[PDB]
Amino acid sequence: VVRVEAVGQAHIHSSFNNIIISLANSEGQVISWSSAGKMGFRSSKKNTPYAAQMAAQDCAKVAYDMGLRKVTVYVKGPGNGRESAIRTIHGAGIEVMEIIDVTPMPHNGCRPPKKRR
RNA sequence: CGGGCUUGAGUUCAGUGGCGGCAGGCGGAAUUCGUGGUGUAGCGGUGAAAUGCAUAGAUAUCACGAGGAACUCCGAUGCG
Numbered sequence: 001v002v003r004v005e006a007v008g009q010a011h012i013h014s015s016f017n018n019i020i021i022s023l024a025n026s027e028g029q030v031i032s033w034s035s036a037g038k039m040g041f042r043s044s045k046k047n048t049p050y051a052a053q054m055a056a057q058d059c060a061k062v063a064y065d066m067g068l069r070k071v072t073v074y075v076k077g078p079g080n081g082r083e084s085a086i087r088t089i090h091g092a093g094i095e096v097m098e099i100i101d102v103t104p105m106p107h108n109g110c111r112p113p114k115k116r117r
Numbered sequence: 118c119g120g121g122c123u124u125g126a127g128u129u130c131a132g133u134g135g136c137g138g139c140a141g142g143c144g145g146a147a148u149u150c151g152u153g154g155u156g157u158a159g160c161g162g163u164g165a166a167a168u169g170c171a172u173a174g175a176u177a178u179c180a181c182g183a184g185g186a187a188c189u190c191c192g193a194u195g196c197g
Binding site: 001002009011013015017018020021022024025027028029030031032033035037038043044104105106107108109110111 | 145146147148149154155156157158159160161162163164165176177178179180185186187188189190
């Protein structure tokens with residue numbers, strides 16, 4: 001039981017190891033999602049623009065045939081491929097409205113986990 | 118030993134300044150846990166992997182709730 005009428009929000013959660021693209025309606029209810037690991041890029045190449053393009057194309061094709069036409073992009077986390085995903089969901093029928101970087105930064109919060117040697 | 122002086126020293130008055138100390142209040146970002154909604158094939162991690170968590174419903178996303186800790190930019194100087 002979902003209902004996405006005309007416009008929605010795309011969420012990209014990237015990191016140094018993987019990228020997850022998830023499209024949702026105005027109430028943040030996900031209708032489709034994809035990732036490099038889902039596409040089958042289990043390697044160091046999970047953080048590749050090609051993998052991001054493949055995942056974004058799959059997600060956009062899966063979600064376009066549901067009434068989704070316009071989307072607003074939110075991006076969290078670093079990593080190559082966010083631009084590729086944005087371009088792919090822009091060119092796969094879905095029209096982008098704005099690009100918003102919601103990457104969370106701390107105002108000196110909790111302690112980071114040590115340092116690798 | 119006795120007397121004198123104002124430069125040392127101290128007291129007063131004024132100006133200016135500070136992450137200087139102790140104590141009480143208040144705040145936002147982030148993180149963790151629980152509850153509910155959407156959704157399903159993976160997430161996480163490495164030089165590469167596995168252990169680990171997941172169809173008895175994870176990662177992701179939205180809302181409600183709870184608690185602890187530290188204070189981005191200013192910001193390299195200043196105080197003791």
